Amino acid sequence: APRKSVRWCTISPAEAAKCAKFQRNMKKVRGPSVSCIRKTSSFECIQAIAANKADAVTLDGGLVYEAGLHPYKLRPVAAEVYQTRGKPQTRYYAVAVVKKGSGFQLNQLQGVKSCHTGLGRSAGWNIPIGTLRPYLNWTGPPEPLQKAVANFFSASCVPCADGKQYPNLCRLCAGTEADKCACSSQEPYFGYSGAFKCLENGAGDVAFVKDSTVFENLPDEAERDKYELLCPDNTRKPVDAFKECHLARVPSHAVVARSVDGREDLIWKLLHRAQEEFGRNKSSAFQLFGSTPGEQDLLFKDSALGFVRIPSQIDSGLYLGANYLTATQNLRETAAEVAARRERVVWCAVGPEEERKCKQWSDVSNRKVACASASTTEECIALVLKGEADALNLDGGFIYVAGKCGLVPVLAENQKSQNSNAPDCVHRPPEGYLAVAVVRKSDADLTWNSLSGKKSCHTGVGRTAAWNIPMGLLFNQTGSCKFDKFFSQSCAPGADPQSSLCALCVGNNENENKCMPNSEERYYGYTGAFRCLAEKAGDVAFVKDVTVLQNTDGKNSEPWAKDLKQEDFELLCLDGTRKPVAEAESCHLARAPNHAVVSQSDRAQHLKKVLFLQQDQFGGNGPDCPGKFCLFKSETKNLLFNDNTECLAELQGKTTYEQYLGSEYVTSITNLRRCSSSPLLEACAFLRA
Ligand SMILES: O=C([O-])C(=O)[O-]
Ligand SMILES: O=C([O-])C(=O)[O-]
Ligand SMILES: [Fe+3]
Ligand SMILES: [Fe+3]
């Protein structure tokens, strides 16, 4: 029944002390007990936490990165919230502060003395150095980055820098005997504030710090006017114009904990009580976000508004973002590797079969396209968000998720529509597809109004024609969020493997991977959803009209398909009526938006280019189509794109998910959410907050 204490990790005496002050006042307030361990650098704490010696530590974005790397695998539990000069924030701008009357611009730092927070930190190293890589004249990875920087900066103070090999790196650092250049507050030039004393005490010429460090030290606007900011456009701007004059916007410091058995909630309990009891002028007996003048930013960031709990799918990569991640991974890659990645396009393929086709696409494209893969669509989208993949075609349902996370639709699928299959396609307005409810002509008993307790087949949970269109209509007539109870048993890949929804599913061939939301599940997709209805494992199938047409009347030859005939099938009309498959225009549940390709608004243009070429080579009228590759085909498995796609068309203006999906559907998707939400949809609300 009782639950233990959080062992907080400290890096230097002063910090140990404050930590003790913290433990003290905490028990005095009969709140969660703390313990204070002692190491000599955050790098040491990461190790200490990973080896189960400590439990938490506040870290800078840059170290969050290091922490989440393999051997350690830590994860950000809570993020500090900040000033903003406006609305509080979990992001800050890294900047380069300089004195007025020094003349040099950003592209002229060669030979200057520089003061840095510490080796490894966002705005004290990762951001400025990455920005200055182009002037470093440095090989790449085999050659130590430090050997590069040390040669550029005439002398600097970069705490934790191997001053033994690179003495120019520690040169300007003040600090007694072995105190000099320490990776803690021992070294007086450590952190946003030391980087500023090192600047202000005229020891260096430029300081790479946070957007507020100046104001944190110069309360009087007169003091400030003696300083300026190096803008990335080789101009200088006043210290208060950081929104415009910044090297970059990094994510806030965070409290990291182990990934397995890290006691996240003990940690959050602690912090929650601490803010409430000692945060913003709660107390006077102890102040959490305040430190001494000899040393600042002790334990946490002085004057942080508090913390926000970080959701649980969120790992360092998702936390940092593509942008930050890339630049950080960039300082550890050669110019060629970097350059390579920026020009290829990395598709995310979902599950085993999509990846094989992806591999073919790769070789046949002479690697203009490379591949990445994940078992589930959300996993692909996360890859798209960490920046490991660049795009993936998605169904209305998930276009919505992608959008909620800030990805935009690039181009949309255009099935072999019907008017003039001349060049129209790429400019043909996407016309969507009719979602329908299909039942066999046999069970003539069955109708819309008698679906209750019958068995059902679904393409997948989260998808338009299956999930989103019927479920949204039923939840209407039934007023209940009990989705797994409406239909007797069902198959809807992606559902709880232990719920009724996963009951009718079958897994792959030797029946493993039952219910998985990918091709492994034989009943996944519009095809699988139909097979289900057809192998008599289900009574009603929710797919788009065409699905019937493309698998009956010999068209599909797979054992199950072969003998089907469009005649054996009918459509359940909303008004209880029944019409044959072909009648669909007068008996559909709804008209959904074509699947569409999505990417970060960043890559969209490049992405569009490559896609327009690739599809011109192996597309619907691709010259090397049957020849060496057909992008839009896969033997009815609908791999990567639907097998009836003529081309990937323009969005006709609909450039945001809300515009693309349209008012109604976006709405209709939110109402349902009243019933359910997802860890991704949840992780993104935070990340895009
Ligand atoms: O933490 C740091 O050093 C930074 O943000 O620059
Ligand atoms: O993609 C789906 O599942 C659909 O359109 O029904
Ligand atoms: Fe920082
Ligand atoms: Fe769809």
Side-chain angles (χ1 to χ4, degrees), residues 166-186:
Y166 320 113
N168 179 86
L169 292 196
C170 284
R171 222 170 145 178
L172 309 198
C173 295
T176 44
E177 325 302 355
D179 256 9
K180 196 182 181 177
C181 217
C183 203
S184 63
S185 23
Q186 287 312 290

PDB file of all heavy atoms in Angstrom, residues 166-186:
ATOM      1  N   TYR A 166      41.411  19.832 -26.091  1.00  0.00           N
ATOM      2  CA  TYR A 166      41.059  21.134 -26.673  1.00  0.00           C
ATOM      3  C   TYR A 166      41.049  22.277 -25.669  1.00  0.00           C
ATOM      4  O   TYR A 166      40.019  22.908 -25.431  1.00  0.00           O
ATOM      5  CB  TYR A 166      39.700  21.043 -27.366  1.00  0.00           C
ATOM      6  CG  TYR A 166      39.528  19.747 -28.104  1.00  0.00           C
ATOM      7  CD1 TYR A 166      38.589  18.812 -27.687  1.00  0.00           C
ATOM      8  CD2 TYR A 166      40.366  19.413 -29.172  1.00  0.00           C
ATOM      9  CE1 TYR A 166      38.490  17.582 -28.308  1.00  0.00           C
ATOM     10  CE2 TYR A 166      40.277  18.179 -29.796  1.00  0.00           C
ATOM     11  CZ  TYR A 166      39.337  17.275 -29.358  1.00  0.00           C
ATOM     12  OH  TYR A 166      39.229  16.062 -29.979  1.00  0.00           O
ATOM     13  N   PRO A 167      42.228  22.631 -25.168  1.00  0.00           N
ATOM     14  CA  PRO A 167      42.412  23.699 -24.190  1.00  0.00           C
ATOM     15  C   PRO A 167      41.857  25.063 -24.605  1.00  0.00           C
ATOM     16  O   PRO A 167      41.580  25.913 -23.749  1.00  0.00           O
ATOM     17  CB  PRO A 167      43.928  23.715 -24.002  1.00  0.00           C
ATOM     18  CG  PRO A 167      44.446  23.213 -25.315  1.00  0.00           C
ATOM     19  CD  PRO A 167      43.526  22.081 -25.590  1.00  0.00           C
ATOM     20  N   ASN A 168      41.703  25.300 -25.906  1.00  0.00           N
ATOM     21  CA  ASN A 168      41.156  26.578 -26.357  1.00  0.00           C
ATOM     22  C   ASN A 168      39.667  26.655 -26.015  1.00  0.00           C
ATOM     23  O   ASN A 168      39.078  27.736 -25.956  1.00  0.00           O
ATOM     24  CB  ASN A 168      41.327  26.737 -27.853  1.00  0.00           C
ATOM     25  CG  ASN A 168      40.750  28.034 -28.343  1.00  0.00           C
ATOM     26  OD1 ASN A 168      41.438  29.042 -28.317  1.00  0.00           O
ATOM     27  ND2 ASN A 168      39.461  28.041 -28.709  1.00  0.00           N
ATOM     28  N   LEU A 169      39.067  25.473 -25.853  1.00  0.00           N
ATOM     29  CA  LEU A 169      37.659  25.320 -25.504  1.00  0.00           C
ATOM     30  C   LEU A 169      37.370  25.691 -24.053  1.00  0.00           C
ATOM     31  O   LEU A 169      36.272  26.121 -23.729  1.00  0.00           O
ATOM     32  CB  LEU A 169      37.214  23.878 -25.742  1.00  0.00           C
ATOM     33  CG  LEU A 169      37.139  23.362 -27.178  1.00  0.00           C
ATOM     34  CD1 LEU A 169      36.315  22.085 -27.193  1.00  0.00           C
ATOM     35  CD2 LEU A 169      36.481  24.393 -28.082  1.00  0.00           C
ATOM     36  N   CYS A 170      38.339  25.484 -23.177  1.00  0.00           N
ATOM     37  CA  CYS A 170      38.158  25.799 -21.775  1.00  0.00           C
ATOM     38  C   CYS A 170      38.853  27.071 -21.364  1.00  0.00           C
ATOM     39  O   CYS A 170      38.583  27.629 -20.310  1.00  0.00           O
ATOM     40  CB  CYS A 170      38.664  24.655 -20.930  1.00  0.00           C
ATOM     41  SG  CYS A 170      37.495  23.291 -20.966  1.00  0.00           S
ATOM     42  N   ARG A 171      39.748  27.533 -22.214  1.00  0.00           N
ATOM     43  CA  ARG A 171      40.525  28.727 -21.947  1.00  0.00           C
ATOM     44  C   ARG A 171      39.836  29.862 -21.176  1.00  0.00           C
ATOM     45  O   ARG A 171      40.241  30.169 -20.062  1.00  0.00           O
ATOM     46  CB  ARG A 171      41.079  29.233 -23.253  1.00  0.00           C
ATOM     47  CG  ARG A 171      42.475  29.692 -23.187  1.00  0.00           C
ATOM     48  CD  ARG A 171      42.894  29.902 -24.594  1.00  0.00           C
ATOM     49  NE  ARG A 171      43.807  31.018 -24.714  1.00  0.00           N
ATOM     50  CZ  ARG A 171      44.368  31.388 -25.858  1.00  0.00           C
ATOM     51  NH1 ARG A 171      44.095  30.728 -26.980  1.00  0.00           N
ATOM     52  NH2 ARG A 171      45.254  32.377 -25.863  1.00  0.00           N
ATOM     53  N   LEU A 172      38.790  30.464 -21.733  1.00  0.00           N
ATOM     54  CA  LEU A 172      38.129  31.566 -21.033  1.00  0.00           C
ATOM     55  C   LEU A 172      37.408  31.218 -19.728  1.00  0.00           C
ATOM     56  O   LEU A 172      37.073  32.117 -18.961  1.00  0.00           O
ATOM     57  CB  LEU A 172      37.169  32.309 -21.951  1.00  0.00           C
ATOM     58  CG  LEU A 172      37.735  32.769 -23.294  1.00  0.00           C
ATOM     59  CD1 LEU A 172      36.796  33.835 -23.842  1.00  0.00           C
ATOM     60  CD2 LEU A 172      39.146  33.328 -23.148  1.00  0.00           C
ATOM     61  N   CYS A 173      37.163  29.936 -19.468  1.00  0.00           N
ATOM     62  CA  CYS A 173      36.474  29.535 -18.237  1.00  0.00           C
ATOM     63  C   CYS A 173      37.239  29.926 -16.981  1.00  0.00           C
ATOM     64  O   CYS A 173      38.449  29.725 -16.893  1.00  0.00           O
ATOM     65  CB  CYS A 173      36.254  28.025 -18.171  1.00  0.00           C
ATOM     66  SG  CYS A 173      35.139  27.311 -19.409  1.00  0.00           S
ATOM     67  N   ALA A 174      36.524  30.487 -16.008  1.00  0.00           N
ATOM     68  CA  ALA A 174      37.122  30.855 -14.725  1.00  0.00           C
ATOM     69  C   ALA A 174      36.709  29.730 -13.792  1.00  0.00           C
ATOM     70  O   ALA A 174      35.720  29.065 -14.039  1.00  0.00           O
ATOM     71  CB  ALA A 174      36.563  32.193 -14.233  1.00  0.00           C
ATOM     72  N   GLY A 175      37.448  29.499 -12.728  1.00  0.00           N
ATOM     73  CA  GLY A 175      37.072  28.432 -11.833  1.00  0.00           C
ATOM     74  C   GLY A 175      38.400  28.036 -11.295  1.00  0.00           C
ATOM     75  O   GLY A 175      39.374  28.074 -12.040  1.00  0.00           O
ATOM     76  N   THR A 176      38.475  27.743 -10.003  1.00  0.00           N
ATOM     77  CA  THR A 176      39.750  27.362  -9.397  1.00  0.00           C
ATOM     78  C   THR A 176      40.424  26.201 -10.123  1.00  0.00           C
ATOM     79  O   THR A 176      39.928  25.708 -11.136  1.00  0.00           O
ATOM     80  CB  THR A 176      39.617  26.956  -7.899  1.00  0.00           C
ATOM     81  OG1 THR A 176      38.476  26.104  -7.718  1.00  0.00           O
ATOM     82  CG2 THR A 176      39.525  28.178  -6.993  1.00  0.00           C
ATOM     83  N   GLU A 177      41.509  25.729  -9.518  1.00  0.00           N
ATOM     84  CA  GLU A 177      42.330  24.628 -10.009  1.00  0.00           C
ATOM     85  C   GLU A 177      41.617  23.679 -10.966  1.00  0.00           C
ATOM     86  O   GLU A 177      41.642  23.913 -12.167  1.00  0.00           O
ATOM     87  CB  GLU A 177      42.936  23.849  -8.827  1.00  0.00           C
ATOM     88  CG  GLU A 177      43.319  24.693  -7.576  1.00  0.00           C
ATOM     89  CD  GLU A 177      44.329  25.829  -7.843  1.00  0.00           C
ATOM     90  OE1 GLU A 177      44.835  25.952  -8.987  1.00  0.00           O
ATOM     91  OE2 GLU A 177      44.613  26.606  -6.893  1.00  0.00           O
ATOM     92  N   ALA A 178      40.999  22.615 -10.463  1.00  0.00           N
ATOM     93  CA  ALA A 178      40.299  21.697 -11.349  1.00  0.00           C
ATOM     94  C   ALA A 178      38.827  22.098 -11.506  1.00  0.00           C
ATOM     95  O   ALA A 178      38.044  21.411 -12.160  1.00  0.00           O
ATOM     96  CB  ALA A 178      40.433  20.271 -10.854  1.00  0.00           C
ATOM     97  N   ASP A 179      38.463  23.222 -10.896  1.00  0.00           N
ATOM     98  CA  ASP A 179      37.109  23.754 -10.968  1.00  0.00           C
ATOM     99  C   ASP A 179      36.843  24.291 -12.352  1.00  0.00           C
ATOM    100  O   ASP A 179      35.696  24.353 -12.781  1.00  0.00           O
ATOM    101  CB  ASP A 179      36.952  24.930 -10.016  1.00  0.00           C
ATOM    102  CG  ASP A 179      36.194  24.577  -8.769  1.00  0.00           C
ATOM    103  OD1 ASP A 179      35.927  23.370  -8.555  1.00  0.00           O
ATOM    104  OD2 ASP A 179      35.857  25.519  -8.010  1.00  0.00           O
ATOM    105  N   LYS A 180      37.899  24.783 -12.996  1.00  0.00           N
ATOM    106  CA  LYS A 180      37.825  25.373 -14.328  1.00  0.00           C
ATOM    107  C   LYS A 180      37.104  24.511 -15.364  1.00  0.00           C
ATOM    108  O   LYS A 180      37.365  23.315 -15.473  1.00  0.00           O
ATOM    109  CB  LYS A 180      39.236  25.695 -14.830  1.00  0.00           C
ATOM    110  CG  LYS A 180      39.233  26.652 -16.012  1.00  0.00           C
ATOM    111  CD  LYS A 180      40.621  26.941 -16.554  1.00  0.00           C
ATOM    112  CE  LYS A 180      40.548  27.938 -17.724  1.00  0.00           C
ATOM    113  NZ  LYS A 180      41.879  28.339 -18.289  1.00  0.00           N
ATOM    114  N   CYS A 181      36.199  25.128 -16.121  1.00  0.00           N
ATOM    115  CA  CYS A 181      35.451  24.442 -17.182  1.00  0.00           C
ATOM    116  C   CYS A 181      34.627  23.208 -16.753  1.00  0.00           C
ATOM    117  O   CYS A 181      34.337  22.324 -17.566  1.00  0.00           O
ATOM    118  CB  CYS A 181      36.443  24.044 -18.281  1.00  0.00           C
ATOM    119  SG  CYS A 181      35.914  24.132 -20.019  1.00  0.00           S
ATOM    120  N   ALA A 182      34.226  23.154 -15.491  1.00  0.00           N
ATOM    121  CA  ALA A 182      33.441  22.034 -14.978  1.00  0.00           C
ATOM    122  C   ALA A 182      32.077  21.948 -15.611  1.00  0.00           C
ATOM    123  O   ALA A 182      31.531  22.954 -16.034  1.00  0.00           O
ATOM    124  CB  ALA A 182      33.287  22.164 -13.500  1.00  0.00           C
ATOM    125  N   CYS A 183      31.483  20.764 -15.574  1.00  0.00           N
ATOM    126  CA  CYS A 183      30.177  20.563 -16.173  1.00  0.00           C
ATOM    127  C   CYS A 183      29.052  20.793 -15.193  1.00  0.00           C
ATOM    128  O   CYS A 183      28.018  20.140 -15.271  1.00  0.00           O
ATOM    129  CB  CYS A 183      30.070  19.154 -16.712  1.00  0.00           C
ATOM    130  SG  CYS A 183      28.818  19.027 -18.017  1.00  0.00           S
ATOM    131  N   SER A 184      29.237  21.762 -14.308  1.00  0.00           N
ATOM    132  CA  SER A 184      28.267  22.090 -13.275  1.00  0.00           C
ATOM    133  C   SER A 184      28.462  23.553 -12.917  1.00  0.00           C
ATOM    134  O   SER A 184      29.291  24.235 -13.509  1.00  0.00           O
ATOM    135  CB  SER A 184      28.535  21.246 -12.032  1.00  0.00           C
ATOM    136  OG  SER A 184      29.808  21.567 -11.504  1.00  0.00           O
ATOM    137  N   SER A 185      27.744  24.021 -11.906  1.00  0.00           N
ATOM    138  CA  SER A 185      27.856  25.410 -11.467  1.00  0.00           C
ATOM    139  C   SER A 185      29.193  25.738 -10.809  1.00  0.00           C
ATOM    140  O   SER A 185      29.443  26.886 -10.452  1.00  0.00           O
ATOM    141  CB  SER A 185      26.699  25.765 -10.541  1.00  0.00           C
ATOM    142  OG  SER A 185      26.168  24.589  -9.950  1.00  0.00           O
ATOM    143  N   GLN A 186      30.048  24.733 -10.649  1.00  0.00           N
ATOM    144  CA  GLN A 186      31.362  24.951 -10.070  1.00  0.00           C
ATOM    145  C   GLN A 186      32.058  25.937 -10.944  1.00  0.00           C
ATOM    146  O   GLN A 186      32.614  26.916 -10.485  1.00  0.00           O
ATOM    147  CB  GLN A 186      32.131  23.658 -10.076  1.00  0.00           C
ATOM    148  CG  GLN A 186      31.593  22.737  -9.038  1.00  0.00           C
ATOM    149  CD  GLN A 186      31.442  23.453  -7.721  1.00  0.00           C
ATOM    150  OE1 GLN A 186      32.436  23.782  -7.084  1.00  0.00           O
ATOM    151  NE2 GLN A 186      30.196  23.757  -7.328  1.00  0.00           N
TER     152      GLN A 186
END
